[PDB]
Amino acid sequence: MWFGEFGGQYVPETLVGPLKELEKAYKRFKDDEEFNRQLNYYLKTWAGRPTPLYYAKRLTEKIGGAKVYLKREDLVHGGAHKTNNAIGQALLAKLMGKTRLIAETGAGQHGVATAMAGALLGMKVDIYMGAEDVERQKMNVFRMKLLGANVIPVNSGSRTLKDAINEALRDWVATFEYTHYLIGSVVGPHPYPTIVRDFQSVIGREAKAQILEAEGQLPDVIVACVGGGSNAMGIFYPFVNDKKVKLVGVEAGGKGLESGKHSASLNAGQVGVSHGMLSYFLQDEEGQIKPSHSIAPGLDYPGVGPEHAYLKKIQRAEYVAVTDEEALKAFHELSRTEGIIPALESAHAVAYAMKLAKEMSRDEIIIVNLSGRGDKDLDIVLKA
Amino acid sequence: MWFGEFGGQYVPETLVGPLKELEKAYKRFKDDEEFNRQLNYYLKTWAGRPTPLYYAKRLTEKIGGAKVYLKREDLVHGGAHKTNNAIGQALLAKLMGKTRLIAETGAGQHGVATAMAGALLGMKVDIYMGAEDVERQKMNVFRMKLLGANVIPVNSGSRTLKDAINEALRDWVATFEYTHYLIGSVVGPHPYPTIVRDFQSVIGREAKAQILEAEGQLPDVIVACVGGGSNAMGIFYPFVNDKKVKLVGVEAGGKGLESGKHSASLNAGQVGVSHGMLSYFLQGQIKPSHSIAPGLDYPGVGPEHAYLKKIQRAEYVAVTDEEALKAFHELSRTEGIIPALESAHAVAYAMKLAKEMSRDEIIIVNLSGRGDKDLDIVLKAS
Ligand SMILES: Cc1ncc(COP(=O)(O)O)c(CN[C@@H](CO)C(=O)O)c1O
Ligand SMILES: Cc1ncc(COP(=O)(O)O)c(CN[C@@H](CO)C(=O)O)c1O
Ligand code: NA
Ligand code: NA
Ligand code: NA
């Protein structure tokens, strides 16, 4: 339940039962032969795993310091890492006898991933999405509709991701006998932070085998963007006990950390409770969760998962921020230099890795998690 | 040079030297270990090959006949099979000492693939695109620009794909010393039909190993959409000498074969010489095609398909806009895969064919691309 002081299960009594049933089923199926056979079968044949590890040679030589490798989650079916978790949980839900999936989404990538997994397994899918987010994600909303899902616009509160989560929790209270709430990041009440990290850890396990193949040794640094924290936990987790491997999480710096328009929960937030968890949140003086800002629509969650709060506290991982400007610069740079158009979320990680590589030796190795592709962001990049 | 009577190299004398230089370079490099080292390295680590072969269980059960497997070229970097050929030819060009790639594109996928390959290998890229196509492919034009390529609108003729090819040929004639014309399908003068097919044959080589792993036997039928014909040749070619494997190419039937608003060159075209090759073309003058699928816009077809049709090694059919759009929706809802509108033609035909076959028989459908590029077309139609 806990990662030191962070995490927990801060929910009404009506969700204790459902969460207990979920934890029970997860413990039964996580190491089950048939569950893992099916999961790996879908990840391979439908999602296209393993994704490659790409040496960005041109980008590396241009900067003139450390080698930059890219873990290519942009190539997963759906165009982002979210699919890995969507399949895992959707299959778990099917084996628990559930017939319906609900999920929140901000950027729309988790919504699409959930709609895809639901279609694959023959389940109903309703996606809760803040009305502000529906308005700016027309194409992802259309993708979800083509996949057979219904997108439910959320008009309560600030009409954003935090509000979508609140409506989904309210739905799940009444519908849990037949509905699984498919949370999309390492957030929410226990057991969700643990489950989502476990279903994304395939990223790190592949990346470890692939870097040993390419370089014969573990990397010096792993860099990943951090919204709620799932792509970062996925690549980090298999290296946590390799003590010489530095772990760097990159939050959205927005218009700057001192501007009050960013999504850097670990950097600038405070401890608090929301969505069932004790973690870091951007909060005002009256304990209200604040709206976050980022040019990357997927770095929109005002909190961060408790396992990242914990890794920061024990100083196992370092957390930094990169601005909208720096992320954009990286979006263009990677597109031009390596012929890969990254998601704006992922461009934050690329932006930091480029800064860091310049300060490091040519013998050293950085792995960047490229959490998604940039096709979804083309209009945003045009406008900025 | 020829596939039966089809193909050849019917070009002005100014193109003969350049084509002979390309032929010689290709013969040198095609089985060279060093060339193949670099090509396989980029296909694996950058493009993400091999793509999976997926058993569409829900689609199969619903139809109630043959097993339907999908070769997942939708998962290749860039979202379509075009990348396989773009990398192979861009690398060839690089090794020949060229500094610039030019390419035609209609739908914009070959344009993007060429832009990506050029960015990867440090080569200038100019994409010729008919002004009518530039106009309705806003996002692909923008992906190309983000990738560092210049898009040159074509305002001559009908301002579509055939005219882009004409302009690119005029450019290449002048600039071939340092420019490679990176043709996107199995069309044009020898050696292009052969080169493009060879660079797409990885699709079939994977699919063969994958179906032997999954089912312990070769498939009964392979189904692929046919524009110029590259994704179909890619998956077909490694099975040509497996006598019991049926090969089915699916052309764009458009508004219906009787309407004359389609792109079914093999079904309803006439044999003739154009773009340096003897093949089937729609027409007395060659006309622009119609299809809901922007990628099935070439008025002609590759000469190797003309040949397979004539010897009856492959069967060719047509699927309408309406049927393709139905299949786009069906695959999205039933399997959670949004296909390209081009590929949806193959899916549509495969669904018709599977119904008539037994439950132990196997169809492989080539899913040539993903449908993200077609979302606005499908929004307007539906
Ligand atoms: C491509 C990509 N990369 C990174 C992230 C950040 O999330 P993570 O920190 O859980 O990986 C997201 C989040 N996207 C979420 C939240 O808005 C969604 O609902 O789609 C993403 O879409
Ligand atoms: C996804 C997809 N599937 C199929 C085809 C048909 O081409 P083929 O028959 O050469 O495979 C295309 C063609 N696309 C070409 C022609 O317009 C282009 O310039 O982009 C495509 O983009
Ligand atoms: Na792959
Ligand atoms: Na945050
Ligand atoms: Na045609």
Given an 8 Å threshold on Cβ–Cβ distance, is A118 in contact with B336? yes
Vertex B153, ends B148 and B154: CA angle to 5°?
Answer: 140
Q: Write out the residue limits of the CATH 3.40.50.1100 domain(s) in chain A.
A: 3-47+82-200, 48-81+201-384
What six digits make up the tokens of B255?
């508004």
What is the rounded distance in angstroms from the CA atom of residue A145 to the CA atom of residue A140?
A: 9
Annotation: CATH topology of B48-81+201-382: Rossmann fold (3.40.50)
Given an 8 Å threshold on Cβ–Cβ distance, is B54 in contact with A45? yes
Vertex A20, ends A15 and A26: CA angle to 5°?
Answer: 125
* CB contacts, 8 Å: A332 with chain B: 146
Whether B149 contacts B267, CB under 8 Å: no
Overall resolution, Å: 1.7
For A205, phi then psi, to 5°, come to: -65, -45
Question: Given the DSSP bridges, would you call strands B100-104 and B67-72 parallel, antiparallel or unpaired?
Answer: unpaired
Closest CA to B187 of B299, B43, B309: B299
Of B117, B122, B338, the CB nearest to A143: B338
Cα(B206) to ligand 5 centroid in Å equals: 26
3-state secondary structure labels for all residues of B76-127: CCCCECHHHHHHHHHHHHHHCCCCEEEEECCCCHHHHHHHHHHHHHCCEEEE
What six digits make up the tokens of A221?
């640094």
Given an 8 Å threshold on Cβ–Cβ distance, is A45 in contact with B58? no
Cβ(A50) to ligand 1 under 6 A?
Answer: no
Place of tokens 């060279």: B32
Cα(A377) to ligand 1 centroid in Å equals: 13
A48-81+201-384 CATH, one of 2.40.50.140, 3.40.1390.10, 2.40.30.110, 3.40.50.1100? 3.40.50.1100
CA distance A166 to chain B (A): 27
Query: What residues form DSSP beta bridges with A153?
Result: A129
- How many residue contacts between A and B have a Cβ separation below 8 Å? 106
What is the rounded distance in angstroms from the CA atom of residue B332 to the CA atom of residue A118?
A: 11
Cβ neighbourhood burial of A13 (10 Å; 0-12, 13-18, 19+): exposed
Q: Does A58 touch chain B (CB under 8 A)?
A: yes
Annotation: CATH topology of A3-47+82-200: Rossmann fold (3.40.50)
For B189, phi then psi, to 5°, come to: -70, 150
Of A74, A119, A142, the CB nearest to B335: A119
Q: Does A139 touch chain B (CB under 8 A)?
A: yes
**In terms of C-beta distances under 8 Å and separation of at least 24 residues, what long-range contacts does B215-218 make, across chains too?**
B215/B67, B215/B362, B217/B362, B218/B242, B218/B244, B218/B245
Which residue among B67, B71, B73, B82 is the active-site one?
B82
**Who's near B199: CB < 8 A, 6+ residues apart?**
B84, B85, B87, B88, B89, B234
Ligand nearest to the CA of A293: 4
What six digits make up the tokens of B169?
């040929």
Residue with CA closest to ligand 2 atom 1: B369
Cα(A85) to ligand 1 centroid in Å equals: 12
Cβ(B140) to ligand 2 under 6 A?
Answer: no
What six digits make up the tokens of A225?
């963007």
Q: Write out the residue limits of the CATH 3.40.50.1100 domain(s) in chain B.
A: 3-47+82-200, 48-81+201-382
Residue with CA closest to ligand 1 atom 10: A230
CA distance A271 to chain B (A): 39
Given an 8 Å threshold on Cβ–Cβ distance, is A46 in contact with B53? no
